[PDB]
Design a binder for this molecule. Structure first.
Ligand SMILES: CC(C)=CCC/C(C)=C\CC/C(C)=C/CC/C(C)=C\CC/C(C)=C/CC/C(C)=C/CC/C(C)=C/CC/C(C)=C/CC/C(C)=C/CC1=C(C)C(=O)c2ccccc2C1=O
Ligand SMILES: Nc1nc2c(ncn2[C@@H]2O[C@H](COP(=O)(O)OP(=O)(O)OP(=O)(O)O)[C@@H](O)[C@H]2O)c(=O)[nH]1
Ligand code: SF4
Ligand code: SF4
Ligand code: SF4
Ligand code: SF4
Ligand code: SF4
Ligand code: FES
Lengths: 125, 220, 60, 780, 110, 183
């Protein structure tokens, strides 16, 4: 199998750590191994997405210089055959914007490990 | 009716919304009543306005329509019973002695503790000809938040019935199209209802953050 | 901070121990942060201060 | 009840006879200013702030002291110029000497003096003279600072420390303007209820040293809560700032704790932030405990549990909420298909399990605090109300002072709590409790209607003691109530987290009960083999006959034989820990899952009266309860536990309801002969102090400093026979170790030595490996 | 008051509240922190804003915070005239009509 | 463009510096403004000040000609899609100036209706405090953006700068962990 590569985007290193903690090397033993590419800045995330080869992108809607929802909209408008996007929302009322970002799934802060894992499995399945 | 309208029951000294910081001060029970029915000799031209409204409306119709009359801070409010709102609005607009042609809008206010009357719609009416003004108040339960739309009588209430709907869910039955005007149509909930959370985020600081004011302690 | 409409001030008091005193009296504000991306310049803070410790300059 | 009509201002109402004018005004919605008045304290009429004008009285009457009388006419400051003038003059006199400390005062924003000076005070000062001054602040204990200048001498603190808590270590001192609340000398305040004086002070005079200068009300996030520690289940108000709990006020639950706490509940909230908290799932790799992802940890735990099939034990501990304990039981019986479930992480017995099934499980609200205050006679067996369930002590003291409750304790010696209850000791060496209980069948006091027998958890350690208590309750007719020490034990019982019990008091040994619970769980059938208790599970695992353990929130040091417990967990091939904190189990576990503390989790406790004590989370955090850890561990194992949240568990428990069928038989255990202590040896008595080396008390040095001095207590004859002297160090010893503490001659029955079970430097279970009732060598 | 350190509470007020007046200190503290308490009631008050009748429905529940504050902003009502003043004319006429309405959208949406 | 294929010698450095000088000047704002911050932006264009001195008087009516998007006011939920559409319909290189507290962090309006900072939806280059920022403050922020634009790399230098900025950003702790002197 091919290590599924997941892009974790957040200016906050602790959000990236939590995302990587919820999703281990294997979300389930039936699923392939997972390799994480951490990106703290929007330019790096966009360039990585352009390089392709990602199975999922987790974008923090609370990212300081460039929010995850904006990056999600940008990638789904700029990359052809871009992978499913999961957005982390800083509040419940952000749900509407999460829908606008066209992200395949939205997980509110604080990141529930189990909710995030279930959403990731659903997106990769 | 005829009793004071309690919109909230405040218990405990110092406006504590919960158990309270200092022991022994929480036993007070002070109902929060809005001003009640005014004694009949209303002030200024309010007496003339009400006499004319009771003359144009039949005694039976007047009693069925006007639920209450309040004169607070030299301002006249008429608690108009739901259902009867279009009739009294037509009478107020058309009656030459009343002639309240200018309706300034509709304002929604939510009283989650006012049983059977949680949602109030306020209609500020002004008569330029007589240089008078009044307010109508129409109450509706949270269970059946329906009010008769005044679109036929006061077209200006259009968008107001919408804003008030968008922010409270009052249905204003009969409105040509009661669609959200402020919030997106996909929006869930009615923001200005007291039960709708403020929806803020913590304010970020170095090493700390301040939750939104709705989460933090308050005294009223 | 109490009076700020925008929650733009964060303040944490601490004791003026004899070994290290920063202000007269029992308390001093050891942490004092203003989130100027939340400040609306209303000036309620300075009107709130009972010591004039907080002023607002003309620097912008 | 007699009812008297009355007129306050122009309005008229009727109130029960004996009501105070201030209370009538409160019920009517009139706000009379008050400082010294307190509903739960006997009126004192000191501050004179509550003056009102009463028709037929020349002087203004203190509404806080004037009982309502029929046809009385009262005019408050709202409708009487004289009353308003009196109240405002009293306020002015109250403020002349007050310090200009509002900005620096902790009570600022929450100060009754500020509010009542705004609403009933002059706009500006007339006082141009010199203010009275004191050195400020002065510590009256490790926890409480006193600012005598802000003190309005309302005496609420002293009146509380005398009436409510029998700990009058503060009193009003000096005279006149120099009068001040004080402790007299270096002797500290030293009561478990000191924090209440902080919450009862209407000014910033008494303040908590822990909460000092850490916040003002506006930035506090305040949430209703329930105390985690005792089985009292006090309603509380947890206040936290920037995600850190700063204080926990007493709340207002008239049916549970009224407006009081013990110091433990108020200040023992720092345990979750002392640095030992487990923040991520951990796995045993290379013999070291390494951080692991949730996915990897769950997968490893599921693999190990499946490889351990039926040979698994589940130690639930007493800290879990009712929902959490229900999840543990459901996981053990549905997922692990084993009945080896036990929440008792402490000295216990099979007779205890039988008694809990027979008389406790499935029977809620049988006795209530309101009944304790009215019970003509209360018999305490193996129970120290002040050390265990302090609010029970407060209610018993209230009953003693008001309704003349008579308290009897079958205990080796009169603890300070018992003395404060005016209770009479029945001096019994530990283990001889069944003899004393059987010897009270003829006690006329217990025949009296409403008589109550409160049994502590410790009677489980005495064979036949619980059976004797059940027999005594049956013969006398006195209602029997069992009062544990940990908040989650009664919830665990209702959760069915016992080897012989199922949820709702349903006995395991009843085919109908098993069928009903299985139908409610949508499962084929529940395990039928009898379950092993905590001691049996530990013995089996230590012998190597247990394949794995699921240990949730268990302090191995609290078990009667902690050496056995550590050996068991070490020898167990696979150990899964659901622990909030780094612990001994964690050091020896194969998989460790972090679980949210109480402040971060929704749930409900059951207090000793079986009352539900619900609470929503105060801190929103990514931490998850034991419920979800178990649910998703089962899901990885492949069984849908159907407990995604506390709401689901509560709904399932409500659907199951109480058993309501054939009640299990009473224990009826025989009174096994007590061991006889020879020369140089004594029978060990012990109970846990309120403030001791308990883990949840960690991180709070002031509270620990408030703990009672640990002392080994002996009868004078026994101390003389051991060559010791009062105050001199004495060492008690077993084959495992020794505990050395200063000696206190206590007039105990001869041949009995009492120790604090877990006070610092005592740790009786760890240091000696024995519990109350064992024989221990004594020496000077 | 102004001083070499900028704008802030006047030194005389500081002296009054922190030095001599306990009542003054209490009043400053409370009126700044919680603020006044407004007796419960409803009031509709209107002014002639540059764009028309700016009305305010203000409801107090007796607390230190406004229970309900609704602005009838004249721009909100005036924008209902866009259909009347724009339909039939050219887009160039629509621009002039809307500008004549002079809507400030902050008042419109609030 | 071919300017991004140039070798990293002195040629690329000079192209970078001249492009930065050219773009810092003639930095046409988009004809875009949400609330009172828009009024202060107009005042900055007004005679008392002169945005024109900086070559920025041409407020591009269409985003195609716009180079800088001064958000200049509060962004509501319903407006965020529109603002993002306007941003995407500008042609690179683009820059976003979050004028005012509302545009930068939501300001005083910390509630459901406001986005809590336009960086939630568009990359922000400069945050400008004020409510509203006085026109001098806007000019200060604009000059700061000019300084940023002048030092903007290109081509291989741009890629190296992106990598270095990523490496630096991955290490910075969050603001919630700067507990300096907090009790
Ligand atoms: C190929 C090649 C390189 C050849 C070599 C030779 C060579 C280099 C080229 C040859 C020369 C060439 C072709 C050069 C290129 C440049 C060129 C051709 C031209 C471009 C330059 C040019 C056209 C200059 C003049 C343009 C000009 C007259 C500009 C002035 C425009 C003005 C007056 C702007 C001010 C507008 C303004 C006030 C802005 C505010 C906008 C706001 C506030 C928006 C939001 C907003 C609005 C709109 C409200 O009105 C409002 C009202 C009330 C409440 C709220 C609001 C609100 O929110
Ligand atoms: N699984 C789980 N563990 C908890 C929970 N709360 C606390 N714990 C842990 O359980 C362990 C044992 O706690 P206790 O048995 O109460 O010991 P204690 O804290 O000294 O309190 P005592 O019962 O008086 O001994 C502690 O180390 C805590 O870290 C909980 O809600 N769930
Ligand atoms: S000017 Fe002062 S009081 Fe006003 S928002 Fe800014 S920091 Fe807060
Ligand atoms: S106790 Fe009350 S009045 Fe006295 S300084 Fe503190 S807040 Fe001010
Ligand atoms: S310390 Fe507080 S409670 Fe005690 S007398 Fe003084 S003001 Fe009253
Ligand atoms: S009595 Fe028990 S439950 Fe109540 S506050 Fe004290 S420790 Fe907590
Ligand atoms: S920051 Fe201030 S001036 Fe700018 S839009 Fe927001 S409220 Fe208006
Ligand atoms: S409260 Fe009654 S005299 Fe003090």
């Amino acid at each position: 199998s091919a290590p599924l590569r997941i892009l974790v985007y957040s200016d906050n290193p602790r959000t990236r750590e939590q995302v990587r903690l919820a999703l281990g090397k294997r979300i389930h033993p039936e699923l392939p191994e997972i390799e994480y590419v951490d990106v703290a800045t929007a330019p790096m995330a966009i360039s990585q997405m352009d390089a392709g080869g990602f199975d999922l992108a987790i974008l923090d809607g609370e990212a300081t210089p460039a929010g995850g929802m904006g990056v999600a909209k940008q990638v789904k408008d700029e990359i052809d055959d871009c992978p499913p996007i999961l957005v982390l929302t800083g509040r419940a009322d952000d749900a509407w914007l999460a829908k606008w970002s066209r992200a395949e799934a939205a997980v509110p802060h604080p990141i529930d490990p189990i909710r995030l894992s279930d959403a990731v499995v659903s997106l990769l399945r | 009716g005829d009793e004071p309208e309690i919109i909230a029951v405040r218990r405990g000294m110092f406006g504590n919304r919960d158990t309270g910081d200092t022991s022994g001060y929480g036993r007070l029970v002070r109902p929060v009543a809005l001003p009640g029915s005014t004694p009949r000799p209303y002030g200024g031209y309010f007496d003339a306005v009400m006499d004319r409204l009771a003359e144009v409306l039949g005694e039976e119709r007047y009693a069925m329509s006007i639920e209450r009359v309040v004169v607070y801070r030299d301002q006249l409010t008429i608690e108009v019973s739901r259902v009867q709102l279009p009739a009294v609005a037509s009478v107020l607009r058309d009656d030459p002695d009343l002639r309240f042609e200018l309706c300034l809008g509709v304002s929604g206010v939510h009283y989650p503790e006012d049983t059977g009357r949680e949602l109030h719609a306020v209609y500020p009416l002004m008569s330029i000809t007589h240089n008078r003004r009044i307010q109508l108040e129409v109450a509706a339960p949270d269970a059946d938040p329906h009010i008769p739309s005044l679109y036929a009588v006061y077209p200006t209430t259009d968008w107001h019935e919408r804003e008030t709907y968008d922010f409270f869910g009052i249905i204003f039955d009969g409105h040509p199209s009661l669609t959200r005007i402020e919030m997106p149509d996909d929006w869930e909930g009615h923001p200005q209802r007291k039960d709708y959370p403020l929806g803020g985020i913590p304010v970020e600081y170095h090493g700390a953050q301040i939750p939104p004011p709705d989460q933090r302690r308050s005294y009223s | 901070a109490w009076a700020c409409p925008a929650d733009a001030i964060y303040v944490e008091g601490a004791d003026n121990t004899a070994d290290e005193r920063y202000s007269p009296g029992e308390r001093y504000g050891r942490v004092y942060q203003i989130n100027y991306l939340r400040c609306i310049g209303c000036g309620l803070c300075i009107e709130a201060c009972p010591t004039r410790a907080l002023t607002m300059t003309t620097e912008y | 009840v007699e009812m008297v009509s009355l007129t306050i201002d122009d309005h008229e109402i009727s109130v029960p006879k004996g009501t105070l004018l201030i209370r009538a005004a409160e019920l009517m919605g009139i706000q009379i200013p008050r400082f010294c008045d307190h509903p739960l304290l006997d009126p004192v009429g000191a501050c004179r702030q509550c003056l009102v004008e009463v028709e037929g009285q020349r002087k203004p009457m203190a509404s806080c002291t004037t009982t309502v009388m029929p046809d009385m006419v009262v005019r408050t400051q709202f409708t009487s110029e004289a009353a308003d003038k009196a109240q405002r003059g009293v306020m002015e006199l109250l403020l002349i000497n007050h310090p200009l400390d509002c900005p620096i005062c902790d009570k600022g924003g929450e100060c009754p003096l500020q509010n009542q000076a705004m609403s009933n005070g002059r706009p500006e000062t007339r006082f141009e003279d010199v203010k009275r001054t004191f050195p400020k602040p002065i510590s009256i204990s490790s926890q409480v600072l006193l600012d005598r200048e802000r003190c309005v001498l309302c005496a609420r603190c002293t009146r509380f420390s005398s009436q409510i808590a029998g700990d009058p270590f503060i009193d009003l001192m000096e005279r006149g303007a120099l009068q001040q609340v004080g402790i007299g000398q270096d002797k500290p305040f030293q009561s478990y209820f000191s924090g209440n004086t902080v919450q009862i002070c209407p000014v910033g005079a008494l303040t908590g040293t822990a909460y000092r200068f850490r916040a003002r009300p506006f930035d506090l996030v305040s949430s209703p809560s329930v105390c985690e520690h005792c089985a009292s289940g006090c309603a509380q108000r947890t206040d936290h700032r920037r995600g850190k709990v700063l204080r926990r006020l007493a709340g207002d639950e008239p049916e549970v704790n009224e407006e009081w706490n013990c110091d433990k509940g108020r200040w023992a909230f720092t345990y979750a932030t002392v640095g030992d908290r487990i923040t991520t799932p951990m796995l045993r790799d290379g013999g070291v405990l390494r951080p692991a992802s949730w996915s990897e940890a769950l997968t490893v735990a599921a693999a190990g549990l499946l490889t351990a099939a039926g040979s698994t034990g589940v130690l639930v501990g007493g800290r879990c909420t009712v929902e959490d304990a229900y999840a543990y039981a459901k996981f053990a019986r549905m997922v692990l298909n084993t009945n080896d479930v036990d929440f008792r992480a402490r000295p216990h017995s099979a007779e205890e399990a039988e008694f809990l099934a027979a008389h406790v499980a499935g029977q809620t609200m049988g006795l209530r605090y309101a009944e304790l205050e009215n019970a003509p006679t209360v018999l305490l067996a193996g129970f120290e109300p002040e050390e265990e369930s302090p609010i029970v002590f407060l209610r018993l003291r209230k009953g003693v002072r008001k309704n003349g409750v008579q308290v009897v304790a079958v205990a080796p010696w009169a603890s300070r709590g018992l003395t404060k209850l005016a209770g009479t000791v029945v001096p019994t060496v530990p283990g001889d409790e069944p003899a004393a209980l059987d010897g009270m069948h003829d006690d006329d006091r217990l025949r009296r209607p409403g008589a109550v027998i409160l049994v502590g958890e410790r009677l489980a350690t005495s064979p036949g003691a619980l059976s004797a208590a059940v027999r005594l309750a049956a013969a006398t007719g006195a209602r029997l109530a069992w009062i544990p020490r940990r908040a989650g034990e009664r919830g665990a019982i209702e959760a069915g987290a016992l080897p012989n019990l199922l949820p709702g008091g349903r006995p395991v040994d009843d085919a109908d009960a098993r069928a009903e619970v299985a139908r409610a769980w949508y499962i084929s059938a529940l395990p039928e083999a009898p379950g092993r208790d905590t001691a049996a599970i530990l013995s089996t695992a230590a012998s190597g006959h247990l394949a794995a353990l699921l240990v949730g929130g268990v302090e191995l040091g609290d078990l009667p034989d902690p050496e056995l417990a550590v050996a068991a967990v070490r020898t167990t091939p696979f150990v899964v820990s659901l622990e909030l904190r780094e612990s001994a189990v964690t050091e020896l576990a194969d998989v460790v899952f972090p679980v949210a503390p109480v402040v971060e989790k929704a749930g409900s406790f059951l207090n000793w009266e079986g009352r539900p004590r619900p609470f929503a989370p105060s801190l929103k955090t990514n931490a998850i309860p034991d419920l979800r850890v178990l649910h998703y561990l089962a899901d990885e194992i492949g069984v849908d536990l159907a407990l995604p949240t506390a709401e689901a568990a509560d709904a399932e428990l409500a659907q199951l309801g109480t058993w309501g069928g054939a009640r299990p038989p009473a224990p009826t255990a025989p009174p096994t002969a007590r061991p006889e202590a020879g020369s140089g040896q004594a029978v060990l008595a012990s109970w846990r102090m309120l403030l001791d080396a308990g883990r949840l008390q960690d991180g709070e040095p002031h509270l620990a400093g408030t703990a009672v001095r640990p002392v080994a207590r002996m009868s004078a004859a026994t101390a003389a026979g051991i060559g010791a002297s009062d105050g001199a160090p004495v060492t008690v010893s077993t084959e495992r170790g020794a505990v050395t503490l200063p000696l206190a001659v206590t007039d105990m029955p001869d041949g009995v030595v009492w120790l604090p079970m877990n006070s610092p430097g005592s740790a009786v279970h760890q240091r000696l490996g024995v519990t109350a009732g064992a024989v221990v060598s004594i020496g000077a | 008051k102004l001083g070499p350190d900028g704008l802030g509470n006047s030194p005389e007020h500081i002296a009054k509240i922190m030095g001599r007046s306990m009542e003054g200190l209490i009043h400053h503290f409370k009126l700044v922190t919680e603020g006044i308490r407004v007796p419960p009631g409803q009031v509709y008050v209107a002014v002639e804003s540059p764009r028309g009748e700016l009305g305010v429905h203000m409801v107090s529940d007796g607390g230190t915070r406004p229970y309900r504050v609704h602005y009838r902003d004249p721009s909100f009502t005036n924008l209902q005239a866009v259909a009347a003043t724009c339909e039939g004319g050219m887009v160039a006429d629509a621009i002039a009509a809307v500008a004549s309405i002079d809507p400030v959208m902050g008042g419109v949406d609030r | 463009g071919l300017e991004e294929r140039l070798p990293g010698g002195i040629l690329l450095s000079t192209v970078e510096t001249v492009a930065g000088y050219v773009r810092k000047g003639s930095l046409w704002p988009a004809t875009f403004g949400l609330a009172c911050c828009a009024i202060e932006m107009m005042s900055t264009a007004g005679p008392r000040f002169d945005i024109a001195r900086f070559g920025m008087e041409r407020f591009s009516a269409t985003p195609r000609q716009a180079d800088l998007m001064i958000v200049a006011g509060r962004v509501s939920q319903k407006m965020a899609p529109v603002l993002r559409q306007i941003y995407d319909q500008m042609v690179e290189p683009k820059w976003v100036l979050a004028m005012g507290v509302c545009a930068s962090s939501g300001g005083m309006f910390n509630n459901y209706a406001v986005v809590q900072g336009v960086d939630h939806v568009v990359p922000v280059d400069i945050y400008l405090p004020g409510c509203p920022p006085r026109p001098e403050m806007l000019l200060h922020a604009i000059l700061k953006l000019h300084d940023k634009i002048q030092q903007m790399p290109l081509g291989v230098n741009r890629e190296e700068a992106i990598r270095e900025a990523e490496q630096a950003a991955l290490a910075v702790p969050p603001t919630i962990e700067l507990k300096g002197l907090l009790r």
